[PDB]
Design a protein around this ligand. Structure first.
Ligand code: HEM
Ligand code: HEM
Ligand code: HEM
Ligand code: HEM
Lengths: 146, 141, 141, 146
């Protein structure tokens, strides 16, 4: 999506410092807590009955780690995002039937989490590149049926 | 709606914001302008360079209005009535933009609170900022 | 908010809807299911073939609930309280879907009213359906 | 976007009967009336101060006709929509700065208008094809900056 060398640097530079397990657990827990309807898709994960239950839910945390690992595959190949997420697109759209709006919401949550973890590095300009990133992943996953 | 715990989490974070009203508001606005450049077209009369007097003075006003909303959380529509007419009738702000600025404000909060911007705090501010945004747009419905 | 003129435009269209509660509701639901097939996953226990007993009986209930909302337009949250808890806590309906069904209901109204579904009527129903949707989701905030 | 022969027929068949000037005036008037912030983009159009003023506004009506004519260019070439709207995409995104959400809203308004004009022909299945149509035009116009 025509990344500038500067944008690519904001992304790869920050990601190298990211605790994927921690940021991933936070992002997914916050999705489930801030936008509670998303819990519909995680019935098998056990107790999600409160914010504290969700934050202590082992599978939520493990799953968040796998999700942020997936974002890492976008970071690692910024010019082939659409293709990298084709299979996941089919999964979320045809199998899981997750409305695409929720991809956007998870992206916004990740932006906020990155901000709490990297107060200094996450400048407005860094935010711009990372917002471009999460939106590109959301768009790629939305191709799944549109 | 907002619980008493939500309100307590909000005030604890807010009394810090009130200490630097100008810094916080300007940072939220500039993140919006830089990350979502289409919002800049609402401010053609502003010098939008970093830390411009217009951005900082306006930032403080935005934070001040949010602070008023915090005080009168149970009477939002009335308290923001004049502002609601301003943004809808006069400025014709696209409702999507209230969400963009709300989001950018949360980024500023996250950056400044770090570890203390917990999920519980984020939920509280998300509910608060959504409530304020609904009111500033209610003149469209 | 809703004006007295809005309410009059709504009731005039509604007393027609109340004559065919089952037809209208089933048509709105099937347009949603066909146009936005992801919504079908909320109804795995339903036979979703055209005019199924489950679709028609549920259609009537949906229209009935909207009719209740019309009567108590000034007391929506209270009137729909049980339904709000149902759709949020029990069914966990994604808020985007309230907009999809609202839209499909307007398509059904447009189809049946033709020329009489004027911009003024559409505005009135858009405000009404948005108000109902906000309430059915308010347990998320 | 992989149109079925049946979808293409729902579209071309209905469009051939469309009064472009009438449907276009209605769609644009309804956009301005139902979603009043969109009036921000039409300051030069003169009096828009009420629903009745808008419906009697000659330039609103003329402009709506040009907009629906534009949709006609999607109908007339269903497999090249992205490309047909490239210039318009640049116009709405880089010059006019219209948020993409409003493209979706205009599309929904057109769906409703078509329903009031073709009660019999506009079956759920027809609606599905036309919704796919307006969403493809919205997506094509949104490429303009994402
Ligand atoms: C746009 C950002 C997203 C990315 C990159 C993403 C990525 C993934 C990946 C890689 C998996 C497979 C996990 C594994 O290897 O076991 C997965 C599974 C899943 N995702 Fe997402 N996802 C995203 C957003 C969402 C959203 C917004 C929802 C719904 C609110 C959702 C619901 C699910 C569900 C239900 C599964 C099945 C997992 C299970 O049953 O254990 N995802 N996602
Ligand atoms: C968090 C939600 C918001 C709040 C609480 C808010 C509050 C305010 C206040 C109090 C003023 C008046 C300042 C003064 O009297 O000097 C104002 C002005 C203004 N706002 Fe907002 N606002 C919000 C969101 C937005 C958004 C999303 C936009 C569009 C991108 C916007 C565009 C404007 C403009 C153009 C002015 C005129 C200011 C000037 O000329 O100095 N506002 N806002
Ligand atoms: C116009 C807004 C809506 C209204 C007024 C409404 C109203 C209702 C009512 C009154 C019931 C209970 C029927 C009974 O007691 O037999 C119900 C059930 C239900 N609704 Fe909604 N609803 C709305 C939107 C939605 C949406 C958008 C979805 C998701 C796509 C949804 C999914 C369901 C489901 C799954 C049930 C369970 C019904 C059954 O098992 O028979 N509803 N709704
Ligand atoms: C996604 C469906 C849309 C299509 C196909 C479309 C198409 C067009 C076309 C073809 C023109 C040029 C008219 C001419 O030849 O004079 C135009 C102009 C314009 N459009 Fe759109 N448009 C769409 C949506 C929107 C939306 C949602 C807005 C904002 C709410 C908007 C605002 C404008 C404005 C301000 C102009 C400039 C016209 C003037 O100054 O006279 N458009 N559009």
């Amino acid at each position: 999506v025509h990344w500038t060398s500067e944008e690519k640097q904001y992304i790869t530079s920050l990601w190298a410092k990211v605790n994927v397990g921690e940021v991933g657990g936070e992002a997914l827990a916050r999705l489930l807590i801030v936008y509670p309807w998303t819990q519909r898709f995680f019935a098998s994960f056990g107790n999600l009955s409160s914010a504290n239950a969700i934050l202590h839910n082992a599978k939520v945390l493990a799953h968040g780690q796998k999700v942020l690992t997936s974002f890492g595959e976008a970071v690692k190949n910024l010019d082939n995002i659409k293709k990298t997420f084709a299979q996941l697109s089919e999964l979320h759209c045809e199998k899981l039937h997750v409305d695409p709006e929720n991809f956007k919401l998870l992206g916004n949550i990740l932006i906020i989490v990155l901000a709490t973890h990297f107060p200094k590095e996450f400048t407005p300009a860094s935010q711009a590149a990372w917002t471009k990133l999460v939106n590109a992943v959301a768009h790629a996953l939305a191709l799944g049926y549109h | 709606m907002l619980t008493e715990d939500d309100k307590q989490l909000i005030q604890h974070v807010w009394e810090k914001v009130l200490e630097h009203q100008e810094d916080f508001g300007a940072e939220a606005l500039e993140r919006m302008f830089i990350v979502y450049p289409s919002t800049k077209t609402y401010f053609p009369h502003f010098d939008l360079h970093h830390d411009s007097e217009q951005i900082r003075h306006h930032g403080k006003k935005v934070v001040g209005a949010l602070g008023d909303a915090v005080k009168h959380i149970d009477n939002l529509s009335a308290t923001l009535s004049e502002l609601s007419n301003l943004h809808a009738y006069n400025l014709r702000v696209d409702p999507v933009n209230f969400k963009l600025l709300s989001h950018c404000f949360q980024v500023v909060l996250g950056a400044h609170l770090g570890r203390e911007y917990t999920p519980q705090v984020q939920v509280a501010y998300d509910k608060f900022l959504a409530a304020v945004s609904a009111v500033l747009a209610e003149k469209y419905r």
